[PDB]
Amino acid sequence: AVKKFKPYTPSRRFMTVADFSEITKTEPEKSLVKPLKKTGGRNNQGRITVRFRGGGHKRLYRIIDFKRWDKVGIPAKVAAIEYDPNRSARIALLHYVDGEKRYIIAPDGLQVGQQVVAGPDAPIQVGNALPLRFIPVGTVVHAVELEPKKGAKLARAAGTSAQIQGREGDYVILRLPSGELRKVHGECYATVGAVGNADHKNIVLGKAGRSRWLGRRPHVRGAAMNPVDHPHGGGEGRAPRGRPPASPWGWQTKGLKTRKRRKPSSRFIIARRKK
Amino acid sequence: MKRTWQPNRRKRAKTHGFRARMRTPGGRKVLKRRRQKGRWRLTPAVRK
RNA sequence: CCGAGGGUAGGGCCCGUGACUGGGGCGAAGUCGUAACAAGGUAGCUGUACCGGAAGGUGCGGCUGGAU
RNA sequence: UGGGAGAGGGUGGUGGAAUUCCCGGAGUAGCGGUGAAAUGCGCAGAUACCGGGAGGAACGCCGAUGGCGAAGGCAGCCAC
RNA sequence: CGAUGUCGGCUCGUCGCAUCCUGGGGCUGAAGAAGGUCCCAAGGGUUGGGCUGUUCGCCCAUUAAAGCGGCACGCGAGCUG
RNA sequence: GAAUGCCGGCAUGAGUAACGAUAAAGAGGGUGAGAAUCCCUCUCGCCGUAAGCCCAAGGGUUCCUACGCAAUGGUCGUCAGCGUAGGGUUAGGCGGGACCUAAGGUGAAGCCGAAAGGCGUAGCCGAAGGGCAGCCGGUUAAUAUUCCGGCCCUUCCCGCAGGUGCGAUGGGGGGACGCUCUAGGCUAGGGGGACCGGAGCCAUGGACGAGCCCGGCCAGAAGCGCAGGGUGGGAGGUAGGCAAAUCCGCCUCCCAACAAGCUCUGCGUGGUGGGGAAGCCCGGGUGACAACCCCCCGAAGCCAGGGAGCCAAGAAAAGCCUCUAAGCACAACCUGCGGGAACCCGUACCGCAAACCGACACAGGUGGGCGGGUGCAAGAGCACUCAGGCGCGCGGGAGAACCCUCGCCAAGGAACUCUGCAAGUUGGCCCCGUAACUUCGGGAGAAGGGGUGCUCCCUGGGGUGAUGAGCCCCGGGGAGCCGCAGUGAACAGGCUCUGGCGACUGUUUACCAAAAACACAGCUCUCUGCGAACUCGUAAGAGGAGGUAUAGGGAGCGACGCUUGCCCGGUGCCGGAAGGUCAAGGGGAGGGGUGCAAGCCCCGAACCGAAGCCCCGGUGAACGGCGGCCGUAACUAUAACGGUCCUAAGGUAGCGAAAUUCCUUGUCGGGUAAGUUCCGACCUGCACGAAAAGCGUAACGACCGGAGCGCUGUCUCGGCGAGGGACCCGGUGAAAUUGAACUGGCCGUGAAGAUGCGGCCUACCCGUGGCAGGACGAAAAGACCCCGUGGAGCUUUACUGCAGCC
RNA sequence: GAGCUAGCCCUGGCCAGGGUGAAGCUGGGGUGAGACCCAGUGGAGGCCCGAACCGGUGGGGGAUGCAAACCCCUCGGAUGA
RNA sequence: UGGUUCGUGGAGCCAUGGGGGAAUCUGGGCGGACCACCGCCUAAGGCUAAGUACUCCGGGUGACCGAUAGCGCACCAGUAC
């Protein structure tokens, strides 16, 4: 769990990598991948709309099953656990007794060779998927649909988890990975357990070059630019911001709430986020 | 040192060529003007 | 060949000494407070941590070498 | 070999009292605090009372001058 | 101001004299030696170094002496930067 | 007659600079009206990981031959990439199309936009990626995997034979993949041979020799051999692969699992077809019936989709195999054989350059492959050389100053200078040895030394082969020889001590700045619950992301260590269903106009009425800020201490004459003979200070300070020598500039610095090589500075609007 | 107008040779078992030296240039951002 | 909000982006806010020659040019570059 290195180079001093101990298959399923078109941050106009993207490692997309309710009552064996470069979680390859194969994001505690199943009847065991209304209150859970049949949306990053606090009406109350308390419909599926690879957050990139491999190009401070470029531009020598800290587009970036006031979801959010 | 003109037959006909001018209103006005001035060639030569 | 020693370079140990700096001891009648000895007027002491002109204070845990 | 007491250790679970916050109700002119006050909180509806919800910590009675451990130390209850 | 390149250093001089040294003098509170002060004198001479961009100055070791000033603060179609 | 006017023409500078790498030339013969320059020969020199040879791009006849020399060629020209004419590029297999998909572009359906237009799944287009059949030699003045020779191969059509449930733009398999390291066996390529073949050679003192010199191959179907790649076989069930399916997928059972078998490539052999040198003759003949063998080195290439380890987790689609649906099983497909058919476009030539990009026959720039040998530890490094290619399209003399590039130097050795700038020194390999400090990796090639050639003798292990000889790679030991000197030549660190800044490798002002600046791992704040926030767009649509709070955006700080204090009064942001103010709208007290009148029309107070602002709170790794004056101790001095005024609060730790200190070279210490710099200290900090972070910090740095050693032409202080220029002769022949010129010194005068005025002095006429004081010398209508009710970038609590948001 | 230049997207290619010797594995020691130690093996890395290639540090030359950014000597990176 | 001479003006008229929303002659618009009288005209469908504009083209004519003029072009010019 997080391997360090000897300081035999200045960058190896602090660079740490994952242990990869839970991986059991080093190549993807040839029928479950398709090429992932790198955007480099540029949109259909050819315009940079997200800055500092691009130049990272070539990748293939693993088609993940964020529905699960496709195959109610059809068990599947956990055949392997693999690396996916498109998310922080690991992925679990499932051989359905159908002969169908699919990926799910691999929760913590999963083990190759066990069995998983989805549906109202499913037992409350790591890997099983159920509509939220059938899962006991207080269960930790991931891959939650935000609306019935729309796809697992919440709790998908490595180590994240959501907890069913209680129920009212057709809706159940979850505490999200951000500490938010939110109502989600009871028909919404979810999978029990937390997402695996929790040590993902203790990784130290270690050098500039590791951000580049991930496609993260260098971020330039507004204070290093000129008035034409950014509200923090200019100054003779260094300069404090000398005005409320703004983004490149001039909106304040220190506390200014940006969520839309009249949003229809506000009726389903019980309490804003945590720390 | 390396200079600005680096000829490329494929780049030429795809940027200034006849079929490129006909795809936009601005390119068509070029040819309209260029015809109206009696220019002997509407479009740069490139040997395909 | 060896060789007293001379020469070159680099280490180790000890002694003297140094602008200045740190506390220590001692010094009949200096300044500031009053922490301990009575429950010493907030019981004291304690390891540690933080803080404060100073003795000290305070938090956590501990001891009775604590009075009623 | 056959037995016996015990807060001895570790892991995993789990119960109620109470404090705090938030929601709702009902209700009004102060609450809180000290040696005495004041800061503070309260008509933007506090305190006191009821209902619900969220969370963390410590285990009241039994508890004793008691028991266990090499010492430090170990106290709700359940299982290994 | 349709441009007179601006500090200092180097190189290369040349001039003035209110003379730093050498030469000639008077006065001296000039015994001697060595000084003080003024007069005459521009022929020649007027060192090497440490610090600083420095001019200047301070210091070290000497010296007969280690002079002051001018020449677009002499000298960038001569160099340095 | 002037506009630094416009256009043209012609002068000055001037027979001046220059003639484009310092790789280099000389002679003989020839051609021609004419020759340093063209052709031929010999001699010399230069490149040889190229300055040699293939390929691609770009260029577009420049290629070959004949005849020419006006211009082009920096001179010449008889020559040429020039002029005229004639000739030259040949493919089922090479490259591209009639095949595939990539980003991207386009775009049925569909969406959007005043118009023009913008998007957009499928589809289609799009290549140097995938896929797909030719190798050797010969021939031409000029093309050749293209013509010809030999030996091979593919696809389409039709036929015959045999086989089979045939059949597709649909299902499935496959195609199908990274980086680093790398095994086995081969080939490419190279080295040696006492062997095989070869025209000759014996010089000049010796050698007739195991002598010298030249050469000892290439391609090749099936089969076979060696080395490798891919690959389980059978049955039962099936609900999944958007219909079907015997294929695939999943489960169960049997058999076989480092194999074998089957299959596909590489290499070898292989019927057969080729090639074949020095030398000597005149590109050709001969050599020649040429020989065509053994040994060794050996890839980065091949077998290959090989293996291992690793994290950053490494295209698609067709060809192809298989599965079946309609349909059809007189068909259709598969296999083999045979004949027939096989289209379009490119192909010349230059191609690190005189033919491409740079206005030039321009010292610049331009992607891929091959790139020999010997020695130096390796190598594509360095030196020399093969093959092949050149001597750079002005030359001949001379032997000045001065310039560039280069060599050396007595004694001294940084005294030079802003600075050791520059140049010395050091220099590879092997062995010995190697400090503070440290994050234990390092600092480290620290430092400092010793060795290095050749001959003879003995000796150890390795690859090949076989276990031996031979060949080849690594050594150990002993005795000697020579020189000033043995990495004898070329290529190849000077070192240390101590400060500042920045952790680090990186990045940057193309073309005056490479840095301390930017970035950077890491830290904190804050926003965002997904049709996310945010960003681009009028929009649709996109990016964010086929991601989901261990995620994503924004901001500051900048590895790491130890830390980051107090102030929320003002601005910002966060919260606050009360209160105040609040526009449209609601309301309608009450007036007004007009009409004979019902009516029509106008204005209008209270009162309700959003966000915003006001108001009450919170909030600093949010904008920011963090006092003054007076007094006090048993010597003096200084104040732990007290007084009072003010503030929102009064700068904590740490550091300090500092990249910050004005006074200032502060003061004291160190270093020095001497230290405005440097280091260490003190603290009256003009005017440090804690994420515009504070203080340290091993390692790192073409950064910037200070010092020492070494060593030097930097210097005292210069001298000599080399080449390339300058100089002279022959050839060609510019430039800016230029009112006109018959254009001297001084002292004056003058718009205040006079060749040109006054007075005096000096001076025969004209040049060449030189130096730069003047012609307020040339160049650029001064960038500084001011002015203009000139302009542009940028800012904000300047004004007024706009997008955006509420 | 992105045939220059800046960034990104798709698909290809390139980086002689030498040095250092991480994790891992193996063996030995050690212990109750361990950690840990030693040796061999291995071949990591914005590691080290140095061509090609990419740069442009310092000086000199050039300055109507060979060149509207060049030449020479010196120097940086050279498996990687 | 646009048009008109009309820039919010006492601002009608014409047109229309939004909200409300009739009537068929005893219906409706206008005569510069509005009201009355007096008058003018019949919206929410369409077409319609001529008289007006211009000169790529062809003629005729100049107190128009005469090769630096007149078109950029008298000529192989939108060419060479």
Ligand SMILES: CC[C@H]1OC(=O)[C@H](C)C(=O)[C@H](C)[C@@H](O[C@@H]2O[C@H](C)C[C@H](N(C)C)[C@H]2O)[C@@H](C)C[C@@H](C)C(=O)/C=C/[C@]1(C)O
């Ligand atoms: C590299 C070569 C060029 O020269 C220069 O760059 C040198 C460094 C210059 O300084 C030049 C001479 C500039 O001239 C100076 O400009 C100053 C503001 C004013 C000076 N003047 C006495 C006051 C004046 O001499 C320049 C404005 C004039 C140029 C355009 C010029 O005419 C020639 C330029 C060169 C020769 O190409």
Ligand SMILES: [K+]
């Ligand atoms: K100025």
Ligand SMILES: [Mg+2]
């Ligand atoms: Mg590490």
Ligand SMILES: [Mg+2]
């Ligand atoms: Mg390691």
Ligand SMILES: [Mg+2]
């Ligand atoms: Mg894992």
Ligand SMILES: [Mg+2]
């Ligand atoms: Mg794949």
Ligand SMILES: [Mg+2]
């Ligand atoms: Mg696929």
Ligand SMILES: [Mg+2]
């Ligand atoms: Mg981007």
Ligand SMILES: [Mg+2]
């Ligand atoms: Mg696009």
Ligand SMILES: [Mg+2]
């Ligand atoms: Mg586009």
Ligand SMILES: [Mg+2]
């Ligand atoms: Mg962005």
Ligand SMILES: [Mg+2]
């Ligand atoms: Mg993963």
Ligand SMILES: [Mg+2]
């Ligand atoms: Mg829901």
Ligand SMILES: [Mg+2]
């Ligand atoms: Mg990546």
Ligand SMILES: [Mg+2]
């Ligand atoms: Mg940054």
Ligand SMILES: [Mg+2]
């Ligand atoms: Mg800046």
